[PDB]
Structure 1
């Protein structure tokens, strides 16, 4: 009976669609066919959700049907055709699949309401959207899976927190979540999350850092800003990295250890000089405009370490900088046994050990 009703309903809908005229009243016939399908699918565990898909594609197709700005008000009618269908899907206390179906219905209703409200209570719109997004976030979090939509929903809720002036920033406090969207696989969500975190640190005016660990620091902004400068697009936004390095220099807070992937240094052949052999001249490239550091390239012997070739003053501001790297106190009477164990750390009040 159910499969015959589905096949006969599809065939009768196609046969009624073969008649061209009266498409506006044909909405009522499509709703009658949907009610006939809904009466057949009255007791289904998962297929009712598929019947919700039979709603949703029809909710697509009716969205394909009406094409006007004022039909957005008819989409408000579709909001009623969501909400009564939400009344058709509220007959459960708690379940795995019904929670996700209610989450998808609430997301569709919230998208329709945000489409309607943005056409032309402005303070209350943020509160109502935060209430609806909190309900949808709780519904999506009440599941055995789906952490990916929950993280984007929490980021949207924190952006709504940032949509007004707020000193309490959940996304900026969740640097673990920022690193979860920044460490790998995503370079545009992270570039906005780090910009929001840096703006919240700019409007923080506090030195009470995160209490989730021992990370109490006023250079946590610089620690995030190193990743923001690494994940920057180009030198068009180099003023942000320069301003963050200037703030890190002014607020210094000196202990750090950077991977120095923003700088590229290449060495050359070992040589000698007058009274101390100035071996291992190296050429270095950088993204920042101004940098001065005592960069020393260490080298390990069989059982020793030279740790030589440091230059105190560095006015170089270009790729292939060609540092001289004078190396006093040559160990093992300038033997050839010393291999490479190069830290190449360029400390500019913070260590960058490449």
Structure 2
């Protein structure tokens, strides 16, 4: 003799529709806690998301008037006692770290509480507090200490679930303020700053355009596949692709060669600024093949050293070039002075082998 969850949801809606009382939604909180203790061992977590929506409506009830620790402190205190989401069910072999997501949201609420209420500094440089008393952080250095301990314990514990790759792919990629809050040389924290910064370059840009802004200060005034001299140049000289403004703020266009101005070893590059397009290859003087090439221009400087290539069906011919082209404008007549002919352009010479362009760091295409 029982009734299902539809009567529970309809009775919750009818108890919400009952009005004119003057409580702090205790009539809602009674049925919310009863539905919470009815919604624990289901291994479902959707009614835990409904409990999170109940916590959101309670947060809006506290947030109807909460400002400047006159009642913002009351709203943060009500949320810190409303951390019974973390303090009701907490078990291993549960339904995949929904408590870790809820504790992450509650840690965001507590970080907002510490960064609000007459607080100094900014752990995340956030200013999430706009214009408007648990006492866990009694000092500014202790504010960084008590929160980086919080944001590292709650980082990979949410990765214990099924593979979402959601928070620690971003927030543990947000360890810029973990050591470069004030301390300059982040060689200790070089695991994500200047190691795998391309995961937002391969994703959508302008996130990594500030991540690489602090992935150069670990090598701007600091010395000593973690062995390099200037081989961190994909983040230094090949950061001009994400640098949309080059004619303004040309310190991203000066330091590409100023890092190499006292260089010395090679690498690869995309040549995604200067495009290259072919043309009608003609004939020339004695043993001069002389293909025709057109090259674009988006980088600043000149005086390259380059050659073209064209593989046959057996061996490469490497139909060379003058290697002093000095590309300044688009679609210019590159000379492509080519010798050592592989059988008079034998028609299986399909132009597949790349047209590199080296300025001590090679740029294959």
In the superposition, the TM-score normalised over structure 1's length comes to: 0.75
Deviation at 1:353, TM superposition (A): 1.5
Deviation at 1:61, TM superposition (A): 4.4
Partner residue in 2 for 1:144:
162
Distance 2:45 2:256 in 1: 58
Cα deviation, 1:280-323, whole Å, max 9, x if unaligned, reads 23221132100322221123345554423412323331222322
Distance 1:165 1:105 in 2: 28
Distance 1:91 1:303 in 2: 64
Q: 1:46 to 1:246 in 2, by over 3 A?
A: same
Q: 1:281 to 1:140 in 2, by over 3 A?
A: same
Cα deviation, 1:9-50, whole Å, max 9, x if unaligned, reads 965775676655757788998899889988999999885665
Q: 1:180 to 1:50 in 2, by over 3 A?
A: farther
Q: 1:219 to 1:238 in 2, by over 3 A?
A: same
Higher alpha-carbon deviation: 181-190 or 94-103: 94-103
Structure 1 unaligned spans of 5+: 207-213
2:295 and 2:330 in contact (8 A); partners too:
yes
Higher alpha-carbon deviation: 343-352 or 92-101: 92-101
Q: 1:73 to 1:9 in 2, by over 3 A?
A: farther
Partner residue in 1 for 2:295:
284
More helix, by proportion: 1
Q: 1:120 to 1:287 in 2, by over 3 A?
A: farther
2:268 and 2:361 in contact (8 A); partners too:
yes
Deviation at 1:130, TM superposition (A): 1.1
In the superposition, the TM-score normalised over structure 2's length comes to: 0.73
1:41 and 1:51 in contact (8 A); partners too:
no
Partner residue in 2 for 1:263:
274
Deviation at 1:346, TM superposition (A): 0.9
Cα deviation, 1:34-91, whole Å, max 9, x if unaligned, reads 8998899999988566545433443344435657773322222223333455433457
Deviation at 1:6, TM superposition (A): 8.8
Partner residue in 2 for 1:22:
22
SS, match of residue 236 in structure 1 = coil
Distance 1:187 1:68 in 2: 36
Deviation at 1:332, TM superposition (A): 3.8
Q: 1:184 aligns with which of 155, 180, 202?
A: 202
Higher alpha-carbon deviation: 276-285 or 37-46: 37-46
Q: 1:13 to 1:61 in 2, by over 3 A?
A: farther
2:293 and 2:333 in contact (8 A); partners too:
yes
Cα deviation, 1:81-114, whole Å, max 9, x if unaligned, reads 3345543345779874464255345434334324
Distance 2:279 2:92 in 1: 72
Deviation at 1:352, TM superposition (A): 1.1
